[PDB]
């Protein structure tokens, strides 16, 4: 029994491939192989073209009050600041725009084959 080889290198070498997120683009918009076994032809072709969110719907839902509580089953301003509120509403608008853009980006790609095709073609 021998001790292992301790190979020592510069700490900067281990960060050679590392790129800060603010310096690189999202490669998930080109991820085709990641959709296999997870995304179906139904989702890409029939559902999403019909049930994509719109900015108008998102804004309406965000601005509207909370929905009424679900019924139980039955067996049958001195301290107000204008600048702070303007900042907060600008932040809310930015958040809603980000939500819309991310929801559009994360369902843009359609699978090459899809779950249905693979399941049909996969014999026991």
């Amino acid at each position: 029994i021998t001790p292992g080889i301790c190979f020592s290198t510069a700490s900067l070498v281990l960060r050679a491939t590392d790129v800060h997120p603010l310096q690189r683009i999202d490669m998930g918009r080109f991820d085709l192989i990641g959709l296999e076994g997870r995304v179906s032809r139904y989702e890409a072709d029939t559902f999403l073209p019909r049930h994509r969110l719109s900015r108008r719907v998102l804004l309406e839902v965000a601005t509207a009050p909370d929905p009424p509580p679900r019924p139980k089953p039955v067996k049958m301003s001195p301290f107000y600041l204008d600048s702070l509120e303007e900042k907060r509403k600008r932040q809310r608008s930015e958040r809603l725009e980000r939500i819309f853009q991310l929801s559009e980006a994360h369902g843009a790609l359609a699978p090459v084959y899809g779950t249905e095709v693979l399941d049909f073609c996969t014999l026991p």
């Binding site: 997120p21 603010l22 310096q23 690189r24 683009i25 080109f30 192989i33 990641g34």
Partner: protein, 121 residues
């Protein structure tokens, strides 16, 4: 990006995660998609750690402990990192060039995957 001052998952399962990030220019409270809680637990993120979270992907990187806690023990095997200087929320518009070969090799093999076949791959 910033030091974690609070990490509270909100139960309805977890409806959302409320996180508190601190920088030299202030503190911000963020509501996280519940899928990021798994990434935070995998990265072993606790209060006092300096992390960054990607808004578009939810990726979490724990880049060490804050140097304000460097004296909490006399001998720990920890990497202590300065507190970030700018704002918690950082926006940058970038132009990056990629080639078709990069997308080809990116789609030649799968990435990640918690299945046994993916891990063995």
């Amino acid at each position: 990006e910033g030091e974690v001052t609070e990490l509270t998952p909100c139960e309805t399962t977890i409806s959302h995660v409320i996180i508190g990030l601190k920088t030299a220019k202030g503190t911000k409270q963020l509501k996280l998609d519940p899928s990021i809680f798994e990434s935070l637990q995998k990265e072993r993120v606790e209060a006092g750690d300096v992390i960054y979270i990607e808004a578009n992907s939810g990726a979490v990187k724990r880049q060490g402990r804050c140097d304000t806690y460097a004296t909490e023990f006399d001998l720990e095997a920890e990497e202590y990192v300065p507190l970030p200087k700018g704002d918690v929320h950082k926006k940058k518009e970038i132009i990056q060039d990629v080639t078709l070969h990069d997308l080809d090799v990116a789609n030649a093999r799968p990435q990640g995957g918690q299945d046994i076949l993916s891990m063995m791959g």
